[PDB]
Amino acid sequence: KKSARIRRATRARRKLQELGATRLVVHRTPRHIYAQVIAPNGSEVLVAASTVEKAIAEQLKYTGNKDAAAAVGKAVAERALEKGIKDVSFDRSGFQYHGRVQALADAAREAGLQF
Amino acid sequence: MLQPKRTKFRKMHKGRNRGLAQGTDVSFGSFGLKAVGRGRLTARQIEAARRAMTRAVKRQGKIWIRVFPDKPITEKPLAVRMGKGKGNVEYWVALIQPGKVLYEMDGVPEELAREAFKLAAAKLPIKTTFVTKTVM
Amino acid sequence: MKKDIHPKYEEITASCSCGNVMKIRSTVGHDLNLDVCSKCHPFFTGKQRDVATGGRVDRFNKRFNI
């Protein structure tokens, strides 16, 4: 079940590489969750909002669920716009837009993002 | 005799006949007869030499042929004016470039093999001479 | 599992005449008995019975003697 994420994502991530817009990378793990942004070259990331940094996850009850995904989706906007990252495009990373990603990609829009 | 059981397409071009050989050395047995000149070997001549050399070996030992004719030579039929197409395949020819081996032999000793290869040399259009088994 | 297009499933008693009370859900509806119970079935006590070969000396000396 490892290769399915890579194979579904190598369309949209290569299409974002061909575009040149700044990419919003999501991750759907059962226990934890990652989210970050990345320059148009693909090797110099800027922010990192997750639940392995315990400083944000200590004020949240669980890590991998419907409300904590929204918490990390706010916590990436409120450390990305503070450095001033306005131009952004989102990679769904194969895990489809229902539930976790459905809350993460709109808690950012409630917390001020532009995509 | 030898002939291809199948060609992909029917009639091939002539080409040319440049280059040295590839199957240079004795590869299987002990004794060899090797071409020197430049030319063309048909389907009939090599099996005629096969009978003319088997008749001297007297069903002893073993002999190997490596060359196998596959060039679809043609003819234009007699008393037909030169146009109106190509011709139909009449026989099948092999190409022999200078240095290529034809047959190899084992078992039967070398002094018999002198005249036993000389008889099959005398029915062949290009000059050949004997070679031995080389240990590397 | 789709919510509609699969049939009924309700618990029903399946007792055997040798006394194996059991419950299983199915679609059969009515109380369904059992004839053959595999807690005393003739597979581990009752498949010797067929072989019936016999020594021919035994079939000889069962009917008379010398």
Partner: protein, 177 residues
């Protein structure tokens, strides 16, 4: 769920002892039960397809798959896309509640039953088996079968060898031989 209440508590107590294992992962586990009752004769009536898509659906409570012919054969009057097969797949707890109805009732009920032979594991422990008739699952009315045509139960499991996958089923006194 009764046999699975038996399994996790009183099969590992043998399959941990007799085979020198470290973890609870090394023991084999059942994976799925598949029920193919194929009708290769449905070209003369569509009813013989759909009745064979209902007569095994009434056994185990799922609507089944009308699976199609994969490639084409000129001989047996088939092409790409003829619905000929019927398949049910069961996983989890419904697998156990069908395995109960097999091994407690429908295994001795078959006519001239003399066990089920000890080599059907295809070298990897994944089982295969085949009945000859339908009424031996006792969930049918007697004179309400149009024809007689068996199916073949296949117990796909996470067995790894023929020596080491058989003992799982033999721990439920599978009537071998």
């Amino acid at each position: 769920a009764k046999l699975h209440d038996y399994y996790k508590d009183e099969v590992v107590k043998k399959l941990m002892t007799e085979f020198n294992y470290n973890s609870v992962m090394q023991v084999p586990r059942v994976e799925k039960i598949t029920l193919n009752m194929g009708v290769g004769e449905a070209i003369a009536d569509k009813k013989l397809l759909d009745n064979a898509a209902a007569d095994l659906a009434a056994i185990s409570g799922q609507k089944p798959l009308i699976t199609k012919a994969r490639k084409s054969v000129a001989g047996f009057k088939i092409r790409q896309g003829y619905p000929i097969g019927c398949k049910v797949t069961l996983r989890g707890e419904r697998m156990w509640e069908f395995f109960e109805r097999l091994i407690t009732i429908a295994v001795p009920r078959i006519r001239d039953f003399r066990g089920l032979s000890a080599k059907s594991f295809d070298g990897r422990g994944n089982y295969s088996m085949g009945v000859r008739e339908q009424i031996i699952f006792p969930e049918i009315d007697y004179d309400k079968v149009d024809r007689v045509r068996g199916l073949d139960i296949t117990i796909t499991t996470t067995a790894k060898s023929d020596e080491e996958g058989r003992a799982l089923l033999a721990a439920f006194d599978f009537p071998f031989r």
